[PDB]
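Forum: Protein Structure Q&A
Topic: Joint prediction for protein chains with partners

I've read a bunch of threads here and the consensus seems to be that you should model interacting components together rather than docking separate models afterwards. I'd like to see that in practice. Below is the full input, 347 residues plus whatever partners are listed. Could one of the regulars post the assembled result?
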Amino acid sequence: VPSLTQKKFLCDRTMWRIPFSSNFMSMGALTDLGQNMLYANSAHALDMT
Amino acid sequence: QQVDPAMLAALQSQPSGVTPSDDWAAAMDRILALTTRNPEAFRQQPQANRFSAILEAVVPSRTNPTHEKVLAIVNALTESKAIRKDEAGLIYNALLERVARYNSTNVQANLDRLTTDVREAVAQRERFMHDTNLGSQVALNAFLSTLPANVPRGQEDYVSFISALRLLVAEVPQSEVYQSGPDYFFQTSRQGLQTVNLTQAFKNLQGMWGVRAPVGDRATISSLLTPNTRLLLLLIAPFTNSSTISRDSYLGHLITLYREAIGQTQVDEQTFQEITSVSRALGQQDTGSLEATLNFLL
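Posted by a regular:
Agreed with the consensus. Here's the joint model:
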């Protein structure tokens, strides 16, 4: 009998980590793209939807 | 091992890396890129460790040396054994409570006067390790203010023997005299043997300084001398030249002959160093490398 396909992926026990960096790597704790705002009192908002 | 205690206070409370909060002249020395070894080393640090140093150098922080000035005192008291070493974690836990209780402009400047005379006026502690009047000069000047200066026979050699005994406790930093019980003693070394009973020696030598004894008398002084007096004369022998007690007193039969007995061993030890090194140069039984060696030298 013919067949459509349907698929998912199970990945439990963990988060979804988005790194706030530039190359999205783990270079350090005090990140790459983050540390240009060390002495910037600059109220960034974000509409993460 | 160290000389100064405040350097160890500057080793236990200062940052090892260069910071502009305390050593500005070395932290600004490398921001402007003017250094002999590795000059170009501050541009290539990122915005993390530039602004965390370049802000703090053109306007320094204002820290408190109260916790550091007391370690230059608490160490200076435990170097001289005023406090037990098991105890300095309590007194710094009590001095820091003290000088923060009664703090002022004055006490912060009064500790700073006291972390200087434990540096340059603690040179007395460097002084009487050399002159050793810890227990050798002012503890023996009570002994020379105890002996009677009126000896009937030999008035002149009595005050030249103790003139050579004050030189003994002066040219030796380790030797010291002391008051234990009703009599004074004298040890040639700390952690040392050969304690002479100094009161029971000059009382034996009293009434003895003029004898003019002949040279055919050896085994009489078992009822006349005492072996510690015979050992005190051994300890006065290397610091006694040939002009102290000249030739013909019985101490000239003792002090001159004790220098010859020391004069035997100060060249036969060099002989003994040769014999114990040629037993492994030709091959010799090391058990029988000392039995016949000592019998040739005694």
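Chain A has no helices and no strands.
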